[PDB]
């Protein structure tokens, strides 16, 4: 069913507005608690900071705009079900019946696993990592964590865990529908390892640290996904 | 635009050479080049279609 | 290079779609594309003019 370009842009504008309205309304209901929301996010770090160590703000606008930046992305995460539905409704006529049987399970399962990524990272990984990182400084070095740097690190881990949690289930689903077999995944192992570094390079700043902090979660959790593909 | 560093690119080729090997890395780069070639070919033909539709919209809008 | 971020570019297109609309954003992008096309055309012709003048200077300087 061919349609004029404006028809697709009319629909896209309507769906984009519903995404912006959802984010703004959630942001307005949450912007008043920006400092309280930052206390929750920085709670794992504060509990593990050494005696005499406290968080600092090295930027003039950081004390205000870093909590504001945090509650904005919290709004984006909380509005993901609305955003994903608008994405689904825009791409629903494009998908065929056979492609509909795969995208719908992916969209629903991604949302839950992406939240379990934060729950696992916040309640398990953050206490373990912060208790080690904050107490491994060289002698004479005072751990004074910048609030702007901490927010970037936390969202880097939250995005990494949420995305990488979906990889094993996506692999198992692809094995279930028959798109890919465990045998074919084992012979594509060298390419995924190189491909993981390529994906990490593109989606991260040119620092190698950000490349490896992302690529290793994909390739490792790719390997676990192949393991459960046997039990299916 | 994606931010690509020289160190990041060298690591990819270094890892690709030691993992894929002398016989699979050139084919992998050739395959990736074809993907980018097809991506730009698809981008060009769609932009041509959008330009042709915009002219049709102007013809309809001008009359009405 | 002007430093352009993916988030910055998406914001412009998102804001342009909701402000200009489905009927004015494509024309706005088309107009801006023509500006860049004319900008690169102007750069190319002047470089050709500069290259020709440099050849003339060499002829004059070599004789003198």
């Amino acid at each position: 069913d061919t349609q004029p370009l404006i028809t697709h842009l009319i629909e896209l504008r309507k769906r984009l507005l519903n995404c912006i309205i959802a984010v703004i309304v959630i942001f307005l209901c949450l912007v008043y608690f920006a400092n309280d929301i930052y206390h929750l996010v920085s709670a794992p770090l504060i509990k593990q900071l050494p005696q005499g160590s406290t968080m600092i703000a090295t930027d003039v606008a950081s004390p205000f705009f870093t909590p504001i930046k945090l509650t904005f992305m919290v709004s984006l995460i909380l509005s993901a079900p609305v955003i994903l539905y608008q994405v689904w409704a825009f791409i629903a006529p494009a998908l065929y019946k056979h492609e509909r049987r795969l995208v719908v399970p992916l969209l629903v399962s991604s949302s839950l696993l992406f939240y379990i990524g934060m729950a696992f990272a916040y309640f398990v990984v953050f206490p373990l990592a912060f208790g080690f990182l904050a107490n491994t400084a060289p002698e004479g070095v005072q751990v004074s964590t910048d609030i702007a740097s901490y927010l970037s690190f936390v969202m880097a881990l939250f995005m990494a865990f949420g995305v990488s949690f979906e990889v094993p289930v996506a692999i198992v689903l692809l094995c279930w529908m028959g798109i890919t077999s465990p045998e074919d995944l084992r012979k594509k192992r060298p390419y995924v390892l190189v491909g993981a570094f390529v994906v990490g390079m593109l989606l991260t700043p040119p620092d190698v640290f950000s490349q490896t902090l992302l690529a290793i979660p994909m390739y490792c959790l790719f390997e676990i996904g192949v393991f459960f593909s046997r039990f299916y | 635009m994606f931010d690509i560093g020289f160190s990041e690119l060298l690591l990819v080729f270094i890892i690709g050479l030691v993992v894929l090997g002398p016989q699979r890395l050139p084919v992998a780069v050739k395959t990736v080049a074809g993907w980018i070639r097809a991506l730009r070919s698809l981008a060009t033909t769609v932009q041509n279609e959008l330009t042709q539709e915009l002219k049709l919209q102007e013809f309809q809008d001008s009359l009405k | 290079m002007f430093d352009i971020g993916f988030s910055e570019l998406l914001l412009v297109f998102i804001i342009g779609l909701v402000v200009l609309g489905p009927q004015r954003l494509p024309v706005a992008v088309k107009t801006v594309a023509g500006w860049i096309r004319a900008l690169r055309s102007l750069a190319t012709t002047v470089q050709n003019e500069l290259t020709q003048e440099l050849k003339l200077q060499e002829f004059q300087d070599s004789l003198k």
């Binding site: 061919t2 349609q3 825009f90 | 994606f2 991506l39 279609e49 | -």
Partner: peptide, 27 residues
Amino acid sequence: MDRRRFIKGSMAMAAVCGTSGIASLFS
């Protein structure tokens, strides 16, 4: 133009911009 071709083309243009900048698209 159909919805599938619109989505496919839009992603291709976005991918080109991420690999060659916004000036390449307008070329």
